[PDB]
UniProtKB/Swiss-Prot annotation:
Gelsolin-like repeats: 15-55
Superkingdom of the organism of origin: Eukaryota
Organism whose genome encodes this protein: Dictyostelium discoideum
Shown residues within the full chain: 158 to 259 of 362
Residues holding a 1,2-diacyl-sn-glycero-3-phospho-(1D-myo-inositol-4,5-bisphosphate): R5, L6, L7, H8, I9, S10, G11, D12, K13
Miscellaneous: Severin changes its conformation upon binding of Ca(2+) and then interacts with F-actin.
Entry protein name: Severin
Known role: Severin blocks the ends of F-actin and causes the fragmentation and depolymerization of actin filaments in a Ca(2+) dependent manner.
Family: Belongs to the villin/gelsolin family.
Gene field: sevA
Amino acid sequence: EYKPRLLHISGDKNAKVAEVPLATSSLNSGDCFLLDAGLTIYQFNGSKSSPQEKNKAAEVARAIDAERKGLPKVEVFCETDSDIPAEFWKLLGGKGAIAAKH
Ligand SMILES: [Ca+2]
Ligand code: NA
């Protein structure tokens, strides 16, 4: 399905993924998120996220890609990156300040 959804990867060393409301306000600097927009999957790594969380997010993205027979494009970026795509923020309802924690 190409209806955008936001997945939240948390747990620090014990990474878990779960859908959360699709909004910028659902994000936080300590975790990882996958904004699944259908043809494009955006992976946002919180600046304080853990290696296990990054790996989990990547694993979920590959699984989604596999189910979709490789059609989606996957973009990965760190929270502090200077070239995060504008579409990521647009789909989240607009760029804004991220909570330090969930
Ligand atoms: Ca692909
Ligand atoms: Na975390």
